[PDB]
């Protein structure tokens, strides 16, 4: 679980056009995942 990433220019999901202010936006919990190839 990573805390503190920052996006630039949309939402997390349902990404849309940014408003006039708030150029740098928080990033939500991007939990990772690893898997064997083609499996």
> Can you spell out the DSSP letters for the chain?
-----EEESS-SSS-----SS--EEE----------TT-
- The gap between the terminal CA atoms of the chain, to the nearest Å, is 24
- Experimental determination approach used: cryo-EM
- Identify the CA nearest to 25 among candidates 13, 37, 38, 33: 13
CA angle 19, 16, 28 (to 5 degrees): 95
Nearest by Cα to 9 from 24, 20, 27, 21: 24
Residues pairing with 25 in the sheet: 7
Residues 6+ apart with CB under 8 A from 1: 29, 31
Specified resolution (Å) = 8.8
| Alpha-carbon span 3 to 6, nearest angstrom | 10
């Amino acid at each position: 679980y990573i805390k503190g990433l920052y996006l630039e220019g949309c939402k997390w999901s349902k990404n849309g056009l940014d408003d006039s202010d708030p150029k740098k936006i928080f990033a939500d919990l991007p939990i990772l995942h690893v898997s064997a190839i083609n499996k």
